[PDB]
Amino acid sequence: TCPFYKKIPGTGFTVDAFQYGVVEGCTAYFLTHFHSDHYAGLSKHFTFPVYCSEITGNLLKNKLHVQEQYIHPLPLDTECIVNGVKVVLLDANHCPGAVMILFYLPNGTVILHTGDFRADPSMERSLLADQKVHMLYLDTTYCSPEYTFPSQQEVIRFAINTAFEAVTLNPHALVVCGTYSIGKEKVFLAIADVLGSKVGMSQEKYKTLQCLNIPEINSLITTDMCSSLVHLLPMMQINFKGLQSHLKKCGGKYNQILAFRPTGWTHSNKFTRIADVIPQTKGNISIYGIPYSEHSSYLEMKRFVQWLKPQKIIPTVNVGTWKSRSTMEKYFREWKLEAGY
Ligand code: NI
């Protein structure tokens, strides 16, 4: 059944709650972002109002074929009324079109649901600065002090320099980047840019990217593999067998693959710096795992919460085990006692 942490008290609203059939008493289903664990259950047969960003609405319509009459896009940073309740969508710094949702309850309670987010200090100067938030539905994906990772900017710098060096040493080297969802577009677009190439990809992936309102996108991507030296493939294909196989497909245009796997966290993060990352190599194939995250690090999450000073925190991630729940609730108390709220 729909879990409590997907329900907004004092409303008939749910967040990211599309796989439970009809939720009894739900008058509006919000969708924070177009990732499959969150949209799971939507299709062209859905007949309730779906509230979301413009970008997420483009994907619902074009990829899932949800009918237009049930899609309600809202602009960001704007006070809107939904079934008599004031709401605001904020940028979540996750994947394209991902939002956080502020709910202003009739009784005066204010609730923020982060969806999936990567906390950033820039959020401290959004509309969130303007009033008190009482309850916080928090993306706790990496809520543990072992989770460190570099900035997105540092990771892109590393990837750009690595690709540029490799291809300039060997003009017959191919660059491949793995993907399995939207998000992390900067990795493959930054690399393509430094190499003066477009990124080539399947028709399904190209369709997905054309939904995202990225400026000058027609100048950066293509379905013509042959004219591109940065290829996107399914994450599943980013391994030695899958890459040897793909190289055979290119007809001796290339004699070397340099591949990037943008992982979340991997336990090399507890020891190694970004400057010091190395690839797995077999033959003329090298695979780099790079720690490009679109979720808060532990310290980024902690700063955001200590800034916001909520009265109650409801975790939305890692809630399935007692040990995880109890560990998170410990960190939340530490944060509160350290900051004095
Ligand atoms: Ni997500």
Whole-number Å distance between alpha carbons of 218 and 210: 8
The token duo for 2 is 């729909």
**Do the strands 110-113 and 135-138 form a parallel or antiparallel pair, or are they unpaired?**
parallel
Strand order in the sheet with 71-73: 7-8, 13-15, 28-30, 50-52, 71-73
What is the helix (H) or strand (E) element at residue 81, kind and residue range?
A: strand 80-82
Domain ranges of the chain: 1-147+296-341, 148-295
Residue with tokens 């930054």: 190
CA of 35 to the centre of ligand 1 (A): 5
CA of 33 to the centre of ligand 1 (A): 7
**Fold of the domain built from segment(s) 148-295:** Rossmann fold (3.40.50)
The dihedral built from the CA positions of residue 134, 140, 146 and 148, taken in this order, carries a sign that is negative
Q: Which of 255, 263, 251, 250 is nearest to 286 (CA)?
A: 255
Strand order in the sheet with 85-91: 80-82, 85-91, 99-104, 110-113, 135-138, 312-315
Question: Which residues neighbour ligand 1 (ion) by CB within 5 Å?
Answer: 35, 116
The token duo for 273 is 């710096």
Q: Give the three-state DSSP class for 154.
A: helix
Alpha helices in the chain (DSSP H): 36-39, 54-62, 152-169, 185-194, 203-210, 240-249, 298-308, 322-339
The token duo for 180 is 């399995």
Tell me, rounded to whole angstroms, the distance of Cα 12 from its chain centroid.
27
CA of 60 to the centre of ligand 1 (A): 15
Q: Which of 255, 274, 276, 275 is nearest to 263 (CA)?
A: 274
CA of 220 to the centre of ligand 1 (A): 24
The dihedral built from the CA positions of residue 135, 138, 143 and 148, taken in this order, carries a sign that is negative
Tell me, rounded to whole angstroms, the distance of Cα 211 from its chain centroid.
15
The token duo for 133 is 């938030």
CA of 141 to the centre of ligand 1 (A): 10
- Contact at 8 Å (CB) between 51 and 80? no
Q: Which of 42, 33, 55 is nearest to 117 (CA)?
A: 33
Domain 1-147+296-341 carries which CATH code? 3.60.15.10
CA of 216 to the centre of ligand 1 (A): 25
Alpha helices in 76-199 (DSSP H): 152-169, 185-194
Whole-number Å distance between alpha carbons of 71 and 254: 45
- Contact at 8 Å (CB) between 121 and 142? no
Q: Which of 300, 314, 306, 301 is nearest to 336 (CA)?
A: 306
* Per-residue CA distances from 105 to 109, 198, 236, 306, 314 (Å): 5, 47, 44, 23, 17
CA of 91 to the centre of ligand 1 (A): 13
* Per-residue CA distances from 14 to 20, 33, 46, 210, 287 (Å): 11, 14, 15, 29, 41
CA of 297 to the centre of ligand 1 (A): 14
